[PDB]
Design a protein around this ligand. Sequence first.
Ligand SMILES: [Cl-]
Ligand SMILES: [Cl-]
Length: 164
Amino acid sequence: MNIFEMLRIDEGLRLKIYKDTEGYYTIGIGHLLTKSPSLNAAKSELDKAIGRNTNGVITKDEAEKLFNQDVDAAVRGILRNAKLKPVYDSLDAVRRAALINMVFQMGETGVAGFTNSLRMLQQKRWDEAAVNLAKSRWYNQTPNRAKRIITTFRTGTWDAYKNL
Ligand SMILES: [Cl-]
Ligand SMILES: [Cl-]
């Protein structure tokens, strides 16, 4: 298992423009296009992202390319963030993957906001961090996914993803 396989499980793959859990226009493997309620604005962002006139539909290859870019950006975002970088550096490989996942989903800013949780992860207080992470809008809105991430931080293994 690895970060890519992990995110592919959590996000799925759709080749046509769709709305995510929050109602925002998305495509590919969880690639957010816009928060704007306009489909045309969405289509415009898509063309610009792909570099062609798309009609709202992309190929698998295109989806993978956006995915590759998005994961790299997630990582780079963590490392440039004063609050995130130190946590990530303190973590083992599996748990690092869990943090990237959260960043991919909610943005660096969002995650950087889990102050107390970040502190507990840094201190390696797994059970305490898990409880804390659960007290969040994130957990209440996407409980299954949140549960997977939480279990990953708690155990340091890929158990939550094995099977899927
Ligand atoms: Cl892009
Ligand atoms: Cl969910």
